[model samples]
Target: GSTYPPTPPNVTRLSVMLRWMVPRNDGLPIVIFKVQYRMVGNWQTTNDNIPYGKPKWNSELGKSFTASVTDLKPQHTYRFRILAVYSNNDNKESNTSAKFYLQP
Candidate 1:
């Protein structure tokens, strides 16, 4: 599942869900996932939009997950992505998800 940053007061909150599949062949315990966001193009250096790094989004990893970001900058554009990991040294990081550009 995916989680949105957070919802701010007096702002339009997007009630959404995160859906995806994790194809993992390794049978490892404790699957960890890393979540990140950017401004679309040039992901390598533009992770600045996010307030914090090393977001411990998941303490547990399953086949899928979902969450919502209530906090957002209206009229601003950003991107989000998640990574699926395992303990057997065969973790796989998913590609960046579709870009989310707020219109209102």
Candidate 2:
């Protein structure tokens, strides 16, 4: 949540509010999201390896959650997205977050 409609630069505080439909272990859910970042125009698909949207609880999905990553570069570009998998981590879901890029 933010006090204003916009989040500011290095001095401003912002909050990420989120929710998701938690899948099950019988479903064999592996890590599905891969968040990536780099300079504005040089990043490629070859650069992503980890998910930004992490688990808060092992048993809940529909409730709100929040997170923050400190020590981010004060003025730089970045991207964050998600991917889902099933069938031995081969089923890629089409759903994803839009890529985010920000700079000062």
Candidate 3:
């Protein structure tokens, strides 16, 4: 059995961007991370307009990931989550973070 990476932690809302951290897993290596988001009340569909920046690795901070969305409408609340893609073709999705309100 393969050990999948756990959900992303330490999620933070930075203005119009979402940042998260994931600790390294000794079982497998995560190749990439995908970010998912949706507007409040739009649970039927999820948007993939995230511009994921290159993840930065730190010995003390683990893996730092950042994502930003463009053309976000004002007054709409959004939720974000991270998807971890491992080298073994396993995809693990993190729990959705707290709602973020975009002020006009």
Candidate 4:
């Protein structure tokens, strides 16, 4: 699901569903996920949160996690990417997700 046109006039935020697969017995257990985003042409930065950005380690999101990104400027569009961290220190990172937009 994406947050696009026809949204309510008062809506200042939007949500996204993210899910991915990891090969079995890969010896790499994903600790968390990093949500990086940019406003159109701006540089990308990690989602605003403590403990190394947004790392959701839940089974519910395994199917699809409803990520509610907030504090956005209304009528503005943003680009986002999701990253999978395999370790806490010097670990592998999943390929960045396709560019997505949100208009709220």
Candidate 5:
């Protein structure tokens, strides 16, 4: 499921939380999360990455992989999905999330 933070007081910023499969059996360890949004049919990757840490217990949905999108236009509908990456040496990417929209 996808959830968002309280809408900021203005169109200056927004946030989206990702809920998905955790890394365990049949999954590779996640390394970074890349957030992307679409507006007016154009897709743009935001400059935010959720870094995965050790102990294998630090990752959670909103608490870890949420995106704080900034400076968006008012009244525009923004759609989002995330790419979860594993390693660069022998890399892997998760299936992107289904379409979800946000309006400011």
Candidate 6:
């Protein structure tokens, strides 16, 4: 049985974007991480915008993976979640972060 990635934290909301730290792998070897988001009251969907910047791994604090999504609509509340993909095609989704309001 594969262990699921824990919920992501430290989600920071920016202008037209949202940034967050990726949770550390618990047991299985993670291959990649996927980001998902949705407007308040809307169905969640995979984020199309490619996450830029390399993930910074720390020995003490685990991998400080940072991802951001841009060009989102303004004046709307949104929530984001992270999905961890394992080597054996197994995947686990983390809990959705708190809602953030995009400023106009």
> Which structure among the candidates has the greatest lDDT?
6
Cα lDDT of candidate 5 equals 0.49
Candidate 1 local lDDT, residue 21: 41
Candidate 2 wrong stretches, greater than 4 Å: 1-32, 42-67, 91-104
Clashing pairs in 5: none
Alpha-carbon lDDT of model 6: 0.63
User: What TM-score, over all chains together, does every model reach?
Assistant: 0.49, 0.34, 0.69, 0.48, 0.55, 0.73
For candidate 1, the 10 contiguous residues with the lowest summed lDDT are: 3-12
Please provide, for model 2 over 1-104, each residue's C-alpha lDDT reduced to its tens digit, 9 standing for 90 to 100.
11111111122234221233333324444444332234545433333343424453355532122334344454564543233443255534323334344443
- Across 15-83, the per-residue lDDT of candidate 4 in tens digits comes to 644444433333444555555556655545456431323433334323233344555454545555555
Q: How many pairs of residues in model 6 come into backbone collision? A: 0
Tens-digit lDDT string for candidate 3 (57-81): 5547466666665666778787767
Better of 2 and 3 by TM-score: 3
lDDT, candidate 5, residue 33?
Answer: 65
**Full ranking by lDDT:** 6, 3, 5, 1, 4, 2
Window of ten residues with lowest summed lDDT in model 4: 2-11
- Which pairs, if any, clash in model 6? none
Worst 10 residues of 2 by lDDT: 1-10
Please give the CA lDDT of all the candidate structures. 0.43, 0.34, 0.62, 0.42, 0.49, 0.63
Candidate 4 C-alpha error for residue 31, in Å? 0.6
Q: If both were scored by lDDT, which would come out higher, candidate 4 or candidate 5?
A: 5
Model 4 alpha-carbon drift over 4 Å, by segment: 1-27, 46-63, 91-101
lDDT of 6 by residue, 1-104 (tens): 56657455445665434344444546666677777778887545555533323554454555555556777788888878777776687887778888888888
User: How many Å off is the CA of 10 in candidate 2?
Assistant: 18
Supply candidate 2's per-residue lDDT for 82.
32
User: What are the RMSDs of all candidates, in order?
Assistant: 9.7, 10.2, 3.9, 9.7, 8.0, 3.4
Which order, best to worst by TM-score?
6, 3, 5, 1, 4, 2
